[PDB]
Each structure stands twice: as structure tokens, then as C-alpha cells.
Design the sequence.
């Protein structure tokens, strides 16, 4: 009666010209501010008017449509359990639910009040400090109840360790927005990457006409953009999504005259953002922290000579001075303008020879770039030497040169041995970028994640192929309860799919796992599984968990409906929702799963 008056109050405006068609039904549902899938609404509307002359609906029809799309049985069961089948939850009943079923302890009497004030739409009920079913569905569908832990949505990790101690969000050939051979270069590559909190961007520099450097993929048909315009974009967007330092990975193919223009543009456009001298003493023996370098941009490039020479050359104009460096950097001796060489302080790109050579001779401010194929050989045959390397030196992996369509390797292979800059083609849809985007949700999306302790100890014996005494076993149980408004199959003429859910663990080889639910026939709107999945994970700090929702098409084919990936240790506990993303990386809202999550680590217990 209260609920009904609230509801009529919102929608009745819509019926002022009598019964409404489909386009008006849609416009009216939006007034209730719950997201809906058009195909689902279209279906329930067609079933409502199927055997009728006019294909219009009245107010009672519209209520039934709303109830079918928005109300969820799985939420009703829970609500009636805490309400004792009353119409509303008392504030003490809601408190009970928050503490016992979502483990939202410490300030639960507090959070109950806040849930009501934030989500209860019926003014009457809100004033009695109660929650209606309408308010409960809004709360349970909100960002307060998603599976990613609220505490991980801010920068919570220790940001005061040396730079080498972090995983760093890293993009390959950032200027490309499609393939590697014939598609465009575009400033949007840089804008998009930076807005996702990417910290290490690649710029391939080539000589332009008019003596002005340009950016494109050398020896291809990709279009060109000006170097100048890339630096203007970096100036505007570097710190849009994160406070933490950006690295510009320059792959230089310019003549020395155009290299001087590179240096000038960097200096003049970026100003005080650009790091142009050591923070401390000039004899650098460990890298500064991300915290020490907030709001700075660092140049990664080849360098001729010492930092000491750089500090001396600052007393004069260095125009016309050139060095020699050990290679031209290309995807698997050259002249350098010293004006450009002199912008390199903590991020000197150094040719890789061997792990032994690096141990003997490389400095902490020297990084290495290793192609996919070589790095995979080292992971397979020398994983602990690789860990020893990455604990000391910033290491960048990039995709092999034959990936001319911008496909990506699996990045988890390299994170498993502590590689800091695992560079991906950010533009390309696929599981690699889903793992990347999931991983770098953590630590507030700032693009730096502190590596586990066993990858930072310079004398670690960690081997991902045989974890042994580094194991920290975690037991995980996930109840898959339901799905809601899943995207219909591309083949359904109405609103059907045959959904199943695959749960995946990515991590060290012994932890990798796949589980599938049963297939539900012909129900995308409200499939109910109630199925329990169990895992043990030996190295939870490196693990990512992915929910992959598929449509069983035929005996030999499943289609992708949506997915979500996050770090295993960022899982919320108790009842929560899994938001889903399309292959393009678009939000499929309202498509969701409803689960109950519990896990514990063996290390808590004597
Ligand atoms: Ca490149
Ligand atoms: Cl490819
Ligand atoms: Cl891919
Ligand atoms: Na552009």
C-alpha cells in the first residue's frame, strides 16, 4: 500500500494520455533509476501484449513488467529471512544482515542508518529508519555490494619503497589504436591509456619533414602524429587518474638534430613535471620511491655517460654535443644528442646480455627491455635467476614483433617472476587485457602495485615452478547463486541464452584452475545455479580470479556473454555482486552475478 503509493507517485505522469507503447515504457522505466537491458524489457512487454488488438500497456501491466525485470527472488528470500516476512526491515534487522552476511563489522548500527539514508526510496519508510524491499534491491545492486573490496579502491599500499619494487601499469606502442602495420597513430592511444592509470607509455620517434619529429611505427603504413602533440597530451593527462610518476619509454630513431627538438619539447611543455636531476646525492645507489616522485615524469631512453657528467654539463649549453650508445632500440652503435641523454636520470635503458653480466656490472638506475620470446625461455629455464634480476633492476617485457595485429601474450607469466613493466597493446580485446585491467584495479587504480616480499628480497630463492616453502595456502569457497539480466545470445530472437559460468584462477602454474557451472537452458534474465566452487591457492598474492559468463551455442561452441577479473585478495566476503564487462571492455550493467564468497589463509593460524 505504501509501496504502491510510492510507485504510482513516480510513474503516473507517464499515463496522462492513457496506455503507452514500448518507447514510452522504456522512457518511463528510466524514471525509476534502475538500469535495464532493452532486450529483456522488450520481451516482457511483448509477452504482455501478445494476444491483444492494441500493443499498449496500462498501469497494472507496467507494474508487472517492473516486477519481472527488477525484483529478484534471491534477494526476496534473503529479505524475508531478516524481516520475518514483514514488509520492511527494522534498522536492527538490517544491522544484523550487514554484520552476519556481509561481514561489515565495526560501525554496523552506523552503516545501517547510512544504507537507509542512501538507498531507501520510500520517504515514509526512510523516516521510520526502516528499509523496504525497494530499498534493499537498490542497496544490493549498488557499488557498496560489488565483489571488489571497498578498502582496495583507494591507495592503501606502502608507496615508499624503491621503484623497482612495484608492478607498473605498462602499454606497448601506445600511439597505435588498432593493428601495427596499416592502422592509425592517434593521440587517443595516450589519452585512453592514461585515463586507465597506465604509468609507462611508449613513444616511437622518427624524423619528420620540416625538421620536426613525428611518431608512427617505422617502416609501415601507419599514419603519423607529431611528437609535440603527444607531449601536450601527456602534460594534460599524466596525473588525471593517478598522482604517481609516469615513465615515457622513448624508442629513438631520430637524427641528432631532431633528438634535440625532442629534448626541447619535453623541457618546455612539461616544465616542473619533468624530472631533470637526482632527488638526493649524485651517486645514486637505490631508486627513489613512487611517493618521492609524485607528479613527476621520467624519461626512459638510452644514455651516453654518467649522471655525474650530466650534472657538469648543466653549467653550459649542450646543443651540438653528441654521444654514442650501444644500439638502436627495435622490437626483437647509434648517435644520441646529449641534450636528450641528459634528461635520463633513474631510467637508463641498457642492453641486456645475461643475468650474470647484469649482476656483475649493471646499476640500479639501468633497466632492460626483453622481448616476449626470449623472456618466455628465461621463465621456463631460469625462473629464479629472473627473480634475482627483477628484484634488482626494472625490467620491461614487450610483445613479439610478429603480433602485427596487436594481439597480446599472457602477462601473468612475467608477473610471476617480478617483471615490473609488462607492456601490453591496451587497444586489443582479449583475456590478456582483462587480466591487466583487473590487476591494476588494485591500490586505488594508481598504476603501481607493491610486489610480494618474496619477489623484493634480492636473495630470494622463489621459483614459480616449484613454490615450496614460499607457499601461503588460501582456501576459497564461492557459492554461485544467480545471474541477472545477462545479455541475450546474438542468435536469440527474444531474450534467451543458455548461460554457464567459468571460474578461473591465474597465477603460479600449480595454482591455475578452471571450474564450470552447469548450463541453464533458455534463461538469461534470472538463471539460478546455487552451485559451490572450492579452490586452494598456494601463492594468493600473485593470483587473479576471473568470472567468465558464456552461452552454450552448440555441442562444439560457446559464445562470450561477459566477464570480470580482480586480484584474489581483493575479493569481498559474504553476499556480493559480480558486475560484468563485454569483450570491448564496456560495462554490461545491469548484467551481474550474485555470489557468496568466503576464504581464509592458513598463515593466520598457529
Ligand atoms: Ca616501439
Ligand atoms: Cl597479432
Ligand atoms: Cl589478445
Ligand atoms: Na591524433
Sequence:
Amino acid at each position: 500500500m505504501e509501496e504502491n503509493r510510492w510507485f504510482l507517485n513516480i510513474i503516473q505522469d507517464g499515463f496522462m494520455n492513457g496506455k503507452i507503447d514500448f518507447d514510452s515504457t522504456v522512457k518511463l522505466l528510466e524514471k525509476l533509476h534502475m538500469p535495464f537491458n532493452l532486450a529483456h524489457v522488450k520481451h516482457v512487454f511483448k509477452k504482455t501484449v501478445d494476444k491483444r488488438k492494441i500493443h499498449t500497456i496500462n498501469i497494472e501491466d507496467f507494474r508487472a513488467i517492473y516486477r519481472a525485470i527488477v525484483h529478484r527472488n534471491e534477494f526476496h528470500e534473503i529479505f524475508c529471512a531478516y524481516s520475518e516476512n514483514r514488509k520492511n526491515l527494522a534498522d536492527t534487522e538490517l544491522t544484523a544482515f550487514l554484520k552476519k552476511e556481509q561481514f561489515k563489522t565495526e560501525g554496523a548500527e552506523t552503516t545501517a542508518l547510512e544504507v537507509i539514508l542512501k538507498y531507501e526510496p520510500i520517504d515514509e519508510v526512510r523516516k521510520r529508519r526502516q528499509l523496504s524491499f525497494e530499498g534493499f534491491i537498490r542497496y544490493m545492486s549498488s557499488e557498496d555490494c560489488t565483489i571488489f573490496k571497498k578498502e582496495h579502491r583507494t591507495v592503501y599500499q606502502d608507496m615508499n619503497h624503491p621503484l623497482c619494487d612495484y608492478f607498473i601499469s605498462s602499454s606497448h606502442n601506445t600511439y597505435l589504436v588498432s593493428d601495427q602495420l596499416i592502422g592509425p597513430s592517434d593521440l587517443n592511444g595516450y589519452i585512453s591509456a592514461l585515463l586507465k592509470g597506465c604509468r609507462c607509455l611508449e613513444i616511437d620517434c622518427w624524423d619528420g619533414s620540416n625538421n620536426d619529429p613525428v611518431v608512427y611505427h617505422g617502416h609501415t603504413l601507419t599514419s603519423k602524429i607529431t611528437f609535440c602533440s603527444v607531449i601536450h597530451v601527456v602534460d594534460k593527462y599524466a596525473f588525471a587518474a593517478s598522482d604517481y610518476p609516469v615513465v615515457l619509454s622513448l624508442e629513438n630513431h631520430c637524427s641528432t638534430k631532431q633528438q634535440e627538438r625532442i629534448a626541447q619539447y619535453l623541457l618546455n611543455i612539461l616544465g616542473d613535471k619533468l624530472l631533470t636531476s637526482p632527488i638526493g646525492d649524485i651517486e645514486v645507489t637505490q631508486l627513489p620511491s613512487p611517493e618521492a616522485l609524485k607528479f613527476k615524469i621520467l624519461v626512459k631512453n638510452k644514455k651516453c655517460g654518467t649522471i655525474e657528467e650530466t650534472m657538469l654539463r648543466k653549467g653550459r649549453d649542450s646543443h651540438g654535443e653528441t654521444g654514442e650508445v650501444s644500439e638502436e632500440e627495435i622490437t626483437s652503435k647509434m648517435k644520441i644528442a646529449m641534450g636528450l641523454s641528459d634528461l635520463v636520470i633513474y631510467t637508463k635503458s641498457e642492453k641486456f646480455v645475461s643475468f650474470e653480466h647484469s649482476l656483475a656490472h649493471q646499476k640500479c638506475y639501468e633497466n632492460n627491455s626483453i622481448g616476449e620470446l626470449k623472456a618466455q625461455k628465461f621463465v621456463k629455464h631460469a625462473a629464479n635467476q629472473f627473480v634475482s634480476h627483477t628484484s634488482r633492476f626494472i625490467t620491461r617485457i614487450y610483445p613479439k614483433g610478429t603480433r602485427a595485429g596487436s594481439s597480446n601474450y599472457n602477462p601473468q607469466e612475467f608477473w610471476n617472476v617480478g617483471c615490473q613493466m609488462v607492456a601490453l597493446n591496451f587497444q586489443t580485446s582479449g583475456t590478456p587485457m582483462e587480466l591487466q585491467n583487473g590487476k591494476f584495479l588494485d591500490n586505488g587504480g594508481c598504476g603501481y602495485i607493491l610486489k610480494p616480499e618474496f619477489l623484493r628480497n634480492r636473495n630470494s630463492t622463489f621459483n614459480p615452478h616449484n613454490v615450496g616453502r614460499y607457499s601461503n595456502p588460501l582456501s576459497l569457497s564461492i557459492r554461485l547463486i544467480s545471474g541477472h539480466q545477462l545479455p541475450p545470445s546474438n542468435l536469440s530472437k527474444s531474450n534467451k541464452a543458455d548461460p554457464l559460468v567459468q571460474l578461473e584462477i591465474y597465477g603460479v602454474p600449480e595454482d591455475q584452475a578452471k571450474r564450470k557451472s552447469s548450463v541453464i537452458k533458455s534463461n538469461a534474465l534470472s538463471p539460478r545455479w546455487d552451485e559451490t566452487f572450492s579452490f586452494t591457492v598456494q601463492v594468493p598474492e600473485l593470483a587473479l580470479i576471473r568470472f567468465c559468463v558464456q552461452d552454450e551455442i552448440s555441442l562444439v561452441a560457446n559464445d562470450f556473454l561477459g566477464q570480470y577479473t580482480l586480484p584474489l585478495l581483493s575479493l569481498s566476503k559474504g553476499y556480493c555482486t559480480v558486475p560484468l564487462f563485454s569483450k570491448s571492455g564496456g560495462k554490461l550493467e545491469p548484467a551481474s552475478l550474485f555470489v557468496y564468497v568466503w576464504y581464509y589463509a592458513e598463515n593466520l593460524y598457529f
About this structure: The domain at 470-604 is CATH 2.60.40.150 (Immunoglobulin-like). The first strand starts at residue 88 and ends at 90. The CA atoms of residues 170 and 423 lie 5 Å apart. The chain is about 30% helix and 20% strand.
